[PDB]
Design a binder for this molecule. Structure first.
Ligand code: SF4
Ligand code: SF4
Ligand code: SF4
Ligand code: F3S
Lengths: 99, 952, 103
């Protein structure tokens, strides 16, 4: 759906697609690693991988540390580069001057 | 916090031992008994402590080889749950109090003639104990011996009495047997003369370029076993129809028997057996299993005599079991005397009667009738808890004694340490009942063995492992045709049968506390820490009402992969609990699928469900002894399966029973192997590449290994039987930890060597079983070394793969790149630290791994380093600077344990070594050669010798 | 895949083809730079083309050169370190009988 323009200009559709893409990327890393490692050359060395609760707890924990650092960044430092934005404004003014 | 390391004190002796050099291990010759029969073992004492057990090359029945129980006796001695004190009634007591009570009780018996006094031992073969028991019987005429053990040979002596009219001992010399037929005889399993039979059979199966003959094995069994694996033809007949099968076999050869209505497959099998027999007269042998009824033994003796095998492959000796008797009948007589209240004192010497006796005898209830019960158990067993005056028994590795092997040899049980917790032996008790208390076990066996072989004979006997004077004489009994001909010969029927078989790793349940044996994956089943009802897939489908066709497993080569996928889907029914009703008993044991099993037959493994065992195995498995009956102790009549749902978690070390059309296991025929030993390798490569040679090309140079030693190993598939002796030897030698059942369920078992069965062929309900040992292949271009970032896994000058524990950070990448998956990781803290006895069992030449490191097979590097150092020291002390290692100087633990000799280790570069000659054969190949790993551990393809009448 | 890789049906590479696109991109960029130097005075470039497009195309040539080297080294190290025999004959022939000097 990203091929079209109306979908590309819709905000809720972009949020849903981004969430689905992130889930698919985690699934792709899982398919590459776990599935390939489960069944190797010797059939006798075959087993199944079932994740526990602690590696999940580490995952949510890493999300929290990531968001803690982001919230501290947006609270202390400016989240948009200021001098680059005013330079962009000056460049657009010069472009409008040259038509 | 500081100083890098603590103080580390050192405590030497106060008086040095005379013949010990500190830091040099020594070897002593002792004997280990399985079912009363001895086995000579060479046991290693590091600093006065037993640590390793190996074979005694000078002893028959152990020609440099051991069984799994002889290897695990090390940890059995170091169990922290062994009895430490005398218990009068669970109360800690003393030995002098028990002696005074025994003398006072025997004084009352002296008023009678010992009518109330009763004994209860196991299969006794020790001449000293037998002589002291006979002397005690002469002192007390009305006393009775009564020996019994759950795994006995009552059918063998009954068949010998029926045929010859006397007690005889039957020995088989398989080295001159071109055709061997087994009638439910698991002679390739741990039993009487197992190591000698397996060695002779293997040396007859080891084929080479110059080889010209090869023996053939016929087996007829209900549940598949190790013997059925090495069989060229296997017939899954029911357990009851084997007596009628033997009668039909005797009838076809022209000898007195009885025809039986059998299946067309069994008819064609009788045809081929009879045709290969009669053409190999004096070069054949028919073996009857101890489980089979006495008539089967007698018919086998008759068949062997008529064929002329007697004196060539079947030999008869005088009995070597002291008193040969029907043990179950004597147990019934003893429980009858107990129920009548006639017995007043019951002395038991091991055997655990409360747990081992059949359920219909009610031993525990009748045990209350006798007031005084006394037991020596080496543990606080179930019987000792319900008895008075429990006496701790000394372990065979800490006691003086003797024993007799099959064919009779009378070896000496030499101790290696004073008894840790005290504890007396059997002859010490027998001397106590003979009015001779505080008698030393040394002086007792030394007094009996003197005045018979002499002092110089006792010194020579202790030096070696055998006594040269004692051997069962060769006798020639006469055969009674009329008695063996006039026999009912029972027929099968009554429906679903139950087959009681000893557990491959636990035997009668004595070793249920041993962690090494409880964790050892069982052969053909790969289960650990549990017990299951083994049945064929068709039997489970028909009886438990499972939604599978069971006919889709039948097919040709065109749909083999689809059948293997269906077998994978069918294996999902493992764990369903079944309420087996046999004779008034419900067992409710989970089921397991064993393809080779005969239909309408369920195999239940003994030795589980103990309640007074140690911390290991205290509540594992479901007890099958209650449903076991005295009338038939090995076979069953009719049963009700009653599926209950309510699944139970069964744990397996493989979880995949089929090789998915790959070049893992190679099989050929002997007729084609004779013309060209390289024909198996020329195949596959044609179907994979179109040419007869795979022109593998590599981009890595590797190393040279020309003028230096190159350590290599060869595994002969024609000799491997899956006895799992190499696994217990590797565990005992390399300090391998023992993880729980929970850690095995998550696939975290720690084992440097593993045996894989692959259940392949058509039908998949009558499949050929392929056992293959796998350890570290020691790849010259090892892919596990080019991935570890801390260089903890590198390569050696001699081509060995060095795995250094103190450098591993634990990235677990060294395992993902290993094509064979032979590397085990300490995900948690697995090695024991608190138990002192387990710390005493560790081998001091191998580091004990901590949490977070990797392990794998190291070719027993401690033995390679010792031989290299000894070779360098001998070279410099003579002034040669040669440094040359002999061929047989190094022997890995898995090489010494193997009773068949399937594992051969040695120098690759030395052309005259046994490995260099074996690797030069046409059928020598290495696993997963498409990956340019260049393994140093190779395999010799399996060659079969099938009959033309069955194949065509 | 069809024209060039099918010459040896025993060998295949997934990165191959993308290596061909980066190779064709570097060739057409150098070809464009040559033809731009040829027609630099066509009375159309002189009035509408400055040094900025020439600098950008030079930067693109530099980026595609290191891109091609990155793809080729990636394929080489993947096949080299993982010494699988189904992918080694390719780099064997290219390192044999003097072909190494070309590399
Ligand atoms: S290789 Fe191991 S499993 Fe096979 S026969 Fe020898 S000791 Fe037994
Ligand atoms: S078998 Fe595995 S651990 Fe052993 S050398 Fe080869 S890759 Fe390494
Ligand atoms: S060679 Fe040694 S370490 Fe390797 S499997 Fe055999 S006993 Fe274990
Ligand atoms: S990757 Fe190396 S760090 Fe250890 S886990 Fe393997 S030897």
């Amino acid at each position: 759906p990203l091929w079209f323009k109306k979908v590309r200009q819709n905000i809720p559709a972009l949020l849903i697609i981004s969430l689905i893409v992130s889930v698919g990327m985690w699934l792709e890393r899982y398919v590459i690693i776990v599935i390939s490692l489960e069944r190797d050359f010797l059939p006798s060395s075959w087993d199944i991988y079932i994740p526990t609760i602690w590696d999940w707890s580490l995952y949510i924990g890493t999300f929290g540390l990531f968001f803690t650092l982001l919230f501290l960044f947006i609270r202390v430092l400016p989240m948009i580069n200021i001098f680059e934005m005013r330079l962009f404004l000056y460049q657009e003014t010069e472009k409008a001057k040259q038509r | 916090a500081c100083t890098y390391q603590p103080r580390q004190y050192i405590a030497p002796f106060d008086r040095q031992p005379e013949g010990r050099v500190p830091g040099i291990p020594q070897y002593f010759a002792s004997t280990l008994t399985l079912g009363g029969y001895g086995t000579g073992v060479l046991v290693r004492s590091n600093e006065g402590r037993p640590t390793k057990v190996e074979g005694n090359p000078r002893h028959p029945a152990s020609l440099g080889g051991t069984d799994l129980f002889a290897q695990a006796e090390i940890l059995t001695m170091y169990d922290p749950d062994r009895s430490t004190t005398v218990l009068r009634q669970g109360v800690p007591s003393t030995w002098a109090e028990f002696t005074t009570t025994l003398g006072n009780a025997l004084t009352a018996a002296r008023a009678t003639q010992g009518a109330g006094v009763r004994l209860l031992t196991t299969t006794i073969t020790s001449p000293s104990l037998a002589a002291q028991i006979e002397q005690f019987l002469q002192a007390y005429p009305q006393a009775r011996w009564y020996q019994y053990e759950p795994i006995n040979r009552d059918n063998v002596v009954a068949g010998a009495r029926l045929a010859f009219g006397r007690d005889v001992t039957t020995r088989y010399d398989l080295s001159a047997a071109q055709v061997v037929v087994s009638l439910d005889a698991d002679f390739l399993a741990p039993g009487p003369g197992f190591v000698a039979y397996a060695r002779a059979f293997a040396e007859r199966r080891k084929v080479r370029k110059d080889s010209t003959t090869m023996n053939r094995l016929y087996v007829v069994e209900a549940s598949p076993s190790t013997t059925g694996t090495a069989a060229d033809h296997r017939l899954p007949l029911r357990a009851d129809a084997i007596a009628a099968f033997t009668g039909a076999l005797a009838n076809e050869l022209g000898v007195g028997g009885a025809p039986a209505t059998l299946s067309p497959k069994a008819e064609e099998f009788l045809r081929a057996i009879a045709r290969d027999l009669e053409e190999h007269r004096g070069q054949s042998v028919v073996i009857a299993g101890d489980q089979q009824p006495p008539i089967v033994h007698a018919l086998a003796h008759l068949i062997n005599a008529e064929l002329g095998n007697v004196g060539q492959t079947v030999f008869y000796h005088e009995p070597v079991e002291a008193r040969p008797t029907n043990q179950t009948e004597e147990l019934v007589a003893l429980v009858s005397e107990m129920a009548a209240g006639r017995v007043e004192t019951l002395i038991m010497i091991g055997g655990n009667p409360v747990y081992n006796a059949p359920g219909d005898l009610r031993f525990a209830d009748r045990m209350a009738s006798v007031p005084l019960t006394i037991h020596l158990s080496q543990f606080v067993d179930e019987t000792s808890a319900r008895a008075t005056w429990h006496i701790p028994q000394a372990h065979p590795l800490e006691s003086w004694g003797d024993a007799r092997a099959f064919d009779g040899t009378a070896s000496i049980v030499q101790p290696l340490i004073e008894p840790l917790y005290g504890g007396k032996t059997a002859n010490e008790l027998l001397a106590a009942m003979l009015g001779q208390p505080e008698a030393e076990s040394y002086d007792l066996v030394r007094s009996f063995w003197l005045e018979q072989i002499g002092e110089t004979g006792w010194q020579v006997a202790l030096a070696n492992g055998v006594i040269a004077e004692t051997v069962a004489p060769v006798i020639e009994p006469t055969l009674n045709e009329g008695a063996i001909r006039a026999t009912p010969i029972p027929q099968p029927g009554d429906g679903v049968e139950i087959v009681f078989r000893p557990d491959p790793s636990l035997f009668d349940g004595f070793y249920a506390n041993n962690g090494w044996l409880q964790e050892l994956p069982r052969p053909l089943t790969k289960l650990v820490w549990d017990n299951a009802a083994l049945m064929s897939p068709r039997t489970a489908i028909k009886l438990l009402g499972l939604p599978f066709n069971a006919d889709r497993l039948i097919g040709t080569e065109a749909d083999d992969r689809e059948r293997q996928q269906y077998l994978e889907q069918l294996s999902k029914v493992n764990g369903t609990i079944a309420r087996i009703e046999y004779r008034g008993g419900i067992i409710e044991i989970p089921i397991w699928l064993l393809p080779g099993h005969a239909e309408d037959s369920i195999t239940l493994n003994l030795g589980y469900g103990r309640t007074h065992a140690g911390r290991v195995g205290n509540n594992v498995g479901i007890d099958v002894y209650p449903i076991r009956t005295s009338d038939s102790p090995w076979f069953g009549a009719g049963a009700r399966v009653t599926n209950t749902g309510r699944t139970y978690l069964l744990v397996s070390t493989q979880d995949h029973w089929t090789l998915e059309g790959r070049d893992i296991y190679r099989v050929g025929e002997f007729k084609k192997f004779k013309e060209d030993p390289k024909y198996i390798a020329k195949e596959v490569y044609q179907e994979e590449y179109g040419r007869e040679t795979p022109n593998y090309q590599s981009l890595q140079p590797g190393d040279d290994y020309t003028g230096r030693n190159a350590w290599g190993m060869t595994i002969n598939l024609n000799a491997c039987i899956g006895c799992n002796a190499c696994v217990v030897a590797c565990q005992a030698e390399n300090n391998i930890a023992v993880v729980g059942k929970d850690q095995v369920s998550r696939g975290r078992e720690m084992h440097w060597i593993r045996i894989d069965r692959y259940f392949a062929g058509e039908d998949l309900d009558n499949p050929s079983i392929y056992m293959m040992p796998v350890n570290c292949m020691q790849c010259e271009k090892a892919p596990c070394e080019v991935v570890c970032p801390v260089a903890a896994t590198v390569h050696d000058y001699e081509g060995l793969n060095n795995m250094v524990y103190n450098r591993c950070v634990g990235t677990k990448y060294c395992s993902n790149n290993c094509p064979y998956k032979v590397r085990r990781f300490n995900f948690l803290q697995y090695s024991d630290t608190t138990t002192e006895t387990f710390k005493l069992a560790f081998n001091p030449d191998v580091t004990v791994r901590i949490r977070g490191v990797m392990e794998k097979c190291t070719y027993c590097v401690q033995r390679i380093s010792g031989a290299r150092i000894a070779a360098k020291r001998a070279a410099v002390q003579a002034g040669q600077s040669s440094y040359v290692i002999s061929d047989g100087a190094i022997q890995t633990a898995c090489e010494q344990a193997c009773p068949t000799g399937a594992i051969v280790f040695g120098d690759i570069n030395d052309s005259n070594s046994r490995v260099a000659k074996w690797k030069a054969e046409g059928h020598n190949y290495g696993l997963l050669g498409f990956l340019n790993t260049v393994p140093r551990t190779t395999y010799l393809a399996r060659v079969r010798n099938p009959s033309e009448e069955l194949e065509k | 895949f069809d024209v060039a890789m099918s010459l040896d049906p025993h060998w295949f590479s997934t990165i191959y083809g993308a290596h061909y696109m980066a190779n064709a991109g570097l060739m057409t960029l150098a070809f464009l730079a040559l033809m731009m130097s040829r027609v630099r005075d066509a009375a159309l470039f002189r009035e509408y083309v400055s040094v900025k497009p020439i600098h950008d195309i030079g930067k693109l040539i530099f980026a595609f050169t290191v891109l091609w080297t990155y793809m080729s080294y990636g394929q080489l190290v993947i096949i080299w370190s993982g010494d699988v025999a189904e992918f080694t004959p390719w780099y064997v022939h290219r390192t044999q009988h003097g072909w190494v000097f070309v590399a």
